């Protein structure tokens, strides 16, 4: 009846697939909070989680952040007072609302009372990187609370390295959540399936995760599509329903790359059963991923379409070039909300053409696009190198920094005696080091 992500939502931190390291880091902080307070938050314990009034969770969509924060709170007996983007968190309302609970106790904490925190709040300011123009000065006031609160404060966001999030930098314990581990999600998904009365090839359960880029919430929803679609599952159906489901609802981006890369469609015969018009049309079946898909695996095929006496390499270079050209086209299509009339050309230059040059037998296997997550790595690191520059600009363009900050690595990693010497003799602090350490790594 209820969505699956709901009915199968963790009930104990003992069910959060992944980030277990960060969950611990979280739970701890929420434990030593009373003491951290007792000590005026000036004793950064062996964890550092001691000089921070509030914690800042962050990471990709559907990986357990909101589940952890809530759960870690309910586990230490505290009562929860949460807000999110659906609420108005402007500086005005913020100061006329929650500001008042920063040093207050739960009225529910009484009619519930052995609980040691039952009468205390854990403020969960969720979806903070979602505070728009409907929250004037919200981040500022919120970042000010991280310094003057008298109760645990937990903030969640997806992009910690954003400009809007700058005011939060030095003010709180930011624990990172990365994309859960496949085995974790694979194991979890299995458990689900079993309880849902069905089985699935570990190769299917595997590529899903790969498509979902780790979004455990998405896979769960995506996995509830089978039983919800068909009326009655049977002994045999299980093995075949995967097809219609996988090649349609689930891994559709794959059945596209498959068809597109099948040489049988480019041979004189099939060449007219599945016309040029159809090949181009396959593109409009997911014009979002199709270009990414072809580029991803146009070089992992055993071509059957090569002209007589044409090497696999040569034909690839031709598609390589076309892939390149199609890009030029895309950029322009995305430079003017009014250029969609160029998509057909892009269909040809980014998929159909490159494909026809190497279509045939599938040597390896259709892989999801590497470009997306690969675009996260590069981006998430430019932000780092950036803040590092806006700290060394005192001592070359941000570019000349990553192409000259090589020597620095030595006199900052070399042996790790002369510790303090170089470190401080650089005008760097704690975060100035922890940050420069990440990228350099």
Binding residues for ATP: 5, 17, 59-67, 158
Q: Taking CB under 5 A as the criterion, which residues in 65-84 touch Mg ion?
A: 66
Q: How far apart are CA 302 and CA 312, in angstroms?
A: 8
How many Cβ atoms sit within 10 Å of the Cβ of residue 371? 14
Query: Residue 50 is encoded by which pair of tokens?
Result: 């001691």
Q: How far apart are CA 23 and CA 73, in angstroms?
A: 11
Nearer to other proteins, 182 or 325 (CB): 325
Q: Taking CB under 6 A as the criterion, which residues in 158-197 touch ligand AGS?
A: 158, 180
Contact letters for Mg ion, residues 324-363 (x by CB under 5 A): ----------------------------------------
Choosing from 62, 214, 253, 360, the residue that interacts with ligand AGS (CB under 6 A) is 62
Rg, the chain, Cα only: 27
Residue 18 partner contact from ligand AGS, Mg ion, other proteins, none using kind-dependent CB cut-offs of 5 to 8 Å: ligand AGS
Nearer to ligand AGS, 10 or 140 (CB): 10
Choosing from 217, 279, 346, 357, the residue that interacts with ligand AGS (CB under 6 A) is 217
Choosing from 54, 72, 98, 216, the residue that interacts with ligand AGS (CB under 6 A) is 216
Q: How far apart are CA 106 and CA 102, in angstroms?
A: 11
Q: How far apart are CA 30 and CA 69, in angstroms?
A: 10
Residue 385 partner contact from Mg ion, ligand AGS, other proteins, none using kind-dependent CB cut-offs of 5 to 8 Å: other proteins
Residue 238 partner contact from other proteins, ligand AGS, Mg ion, none using kind-dependent CB cut-offs of 5 to 8 Å: none
Residue 231 CA neighbour count, 13 Å, CB half: 0
Give the nearest distance from C-beta 314 to other proteins in angstroms: 6
Residue 430 partner contact from other proteins, Mg ion, ligand AGS, none using kind-dependent CB cut-offs of 5 to 8 Å: none
Q: How far apart are CA 74 and CA 80, in angstroms?
A: 8
Residue 174 CB contacts under 8 Å (≥ 6 apart), including other chains: 55, 56, 57, 58, 160, 168
Q: In what order do the strands lie in the sheet with 153-157?
A: 79-83, 121-125, 153-157, 54-58, 173-176
Choosing from 67, 83, 295, 351, the residue that interacts with ligand AGS (CB under 6 A) is 67
Nearer to other proteins, 46 or 335 (CB): 335
Choosing from 20, 31, 41, 61, the residue that interacts with ligand AGS (CB under 6 A) is 61
Q: How far apart are CA 37 and CA 321, in angstroms?
A: 62
214 scored as a contact of ligand AGS (CB under 6 A): no
| Phi (first) and psi of residue 199, to 5 degrees | -125, 155
Q: Which residues fall in the annotated binding site?
A: 5, 17, 59-67, 158
Give the nearest distance from C-beta 47 to other proteins in angstroms: 25
Q: How long is the chain?
A: 441
Q: Which residues pair with 97 in a beta bridge?
A: none
Nearer to ligand AGS, 31 or 85 (CB): 85
Nearer to ligand AGS, 17 or 352 (CB): 17
- Give, as one character, the DSSP assignment of residue 121: E
DSSP H helices in 32-79: 33-38, 65-75
Choosing from 17, 143, 165, 322, the residue that interacts with ligand AGS (CB under 6 A) is 17
124 scored as a contact of ligand AGS (CB under 6 A): no
Contact letters for Mg ion, residues 37-66 (x by CB under 5 A): -----------------------------x
Query: Residue 182 is encoded by which pair of tokens?
Result: 């496949």
Nearer to other proteins, 27 or 391 (CB): 391
Q: Which residues pair with 157 in a beta bridge?
A: 58
Which residue in the shown chain puts its C-beta closest to ligand AGS? Answer: 64
Residue 345 partner contact from other proteins, Mg ion, ligand AGS, none using kind-dependent CB cut-offs of 5 to 8 Å: other proteins
DSSP H helices in 235-311: 237-244, 252-260, 276-283, 290-296
Give the nearest distance from C-beta 333 to other proteins in angstroms: 10
Give the nearest distance from C-beta 210 to other proteins in angstroms: 15
Choosing from 53, 65, 207, 346, the residue that interacts with ligand AGS (CB under 6 A) is 65
Dump the DSSP string for 153-210.
EEEEES-TTSSTTGGGTTTSEEEE-----HHHHHHHHHHHHHHTT----TTHHHHHHH
3-class secondary structure, 289: coil
- CA quadruple 268, 270, 276, 279: dihedral, nearest 10: -140
Which residues make up the interface to ligand AGS (CB under 6 A)? 5, 8-10, 16-18, 61-67, 158, 180, 216-217, 220
Q: Which residues bind Mg ion (CB under 5 A)?
A: 66
């Amino acid at each position: 009846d209820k969505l699956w992500t709901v009915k199968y939502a963790p009930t104990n931190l003992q069910q959060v697939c992944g980030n277990k390291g960060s969950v611990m880091k979280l739970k701890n902080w929420l434990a030593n909070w009373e003491n951290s307070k007792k000590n005026s938050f000036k004793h950064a314990g062996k964890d550092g989680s001691g000089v921070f009034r509030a914690a800042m969770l962050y990471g990709p969509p559907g990986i357990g952040k909101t589940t952890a924060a809530h759960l870690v709170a309910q586990e230490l007996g505290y009562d929860i007072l949460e807000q999110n983007a659906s609420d108005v968190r402007s500086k005005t309302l913020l100061n006329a609302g929650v500001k008042n609970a920063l040093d207050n106790m739960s009225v529910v904490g009484y009619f519930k009372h052995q609980n040691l925190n039952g009468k205390h709040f854990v403020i969960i300011m969720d979806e903070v990187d979602g505070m728009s123009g409907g929250d004037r000065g919200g981040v500022g006031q919120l970042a000010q609370f991280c310094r003057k609160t008298s109760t645990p404060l937990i903030l969640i966001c997806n992009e910690r390295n954003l400009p809007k999030m700058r005011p939060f930098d030095r003010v709180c314990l930011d624990i990172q959540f990365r994309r859960p581990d496949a085995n974790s999600i694979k194991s979890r998904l299995m458990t689900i399936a079993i309880r849902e009365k069905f089985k699935l090839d570990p190769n299917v359960i595997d590529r899903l995760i790969q498509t979902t880029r780790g979004d455990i919430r998405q896979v769960i929803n995506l996995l509830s599509t089978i039983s919800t679609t068909t009326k009655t599952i049977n002994h045999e159906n299980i093995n075949e329903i995967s097809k219609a489901w996988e090649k349609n609802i689930a891994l559709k981006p794959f059945d596209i790359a498959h068809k597109m890369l099948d040489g049988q469609i480019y041979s004189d015969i099939g060449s007219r059963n599945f016309t040029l018009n159809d090949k181009i049309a396959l593109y409009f079946d997911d014009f979002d991923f199709t270009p990414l898909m072809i580029q991803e695996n146009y070089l992992s095929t055993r071509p059957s379409v090569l002209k007589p006496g044409q090497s696999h390499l040569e034909a690839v270079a031709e598609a390589a070039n076309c892939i390149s050209l199609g890009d030029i086209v895309e950029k322009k299509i995305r430079s003017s909300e009014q250029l969609w009339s160029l998509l057909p050309l892009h269909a040809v230059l980014s998929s159909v053409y490159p494909a026809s040059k190497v279509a045939g037998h599938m040597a390896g296997r259709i892989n999801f696009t590497a470009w997306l997550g690969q675009n996260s790595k590069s981006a998430k690191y430019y932000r780092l190198l950036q803040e590092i520059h806006y700290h060394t600009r005192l001592g070359x363009x941000x570019x000349x920094x990553x192409x000259x900050x090589x020597x620095x690595x030595x006199x900052x990693x070399x042996x790790x005696x002369x510790x303090x010497x170089x470190x401080x003799x650089x005008x760097x602090x704690x975060x100035x080091x922890x940050x420069x350490x990440x990228x350099x790594x």
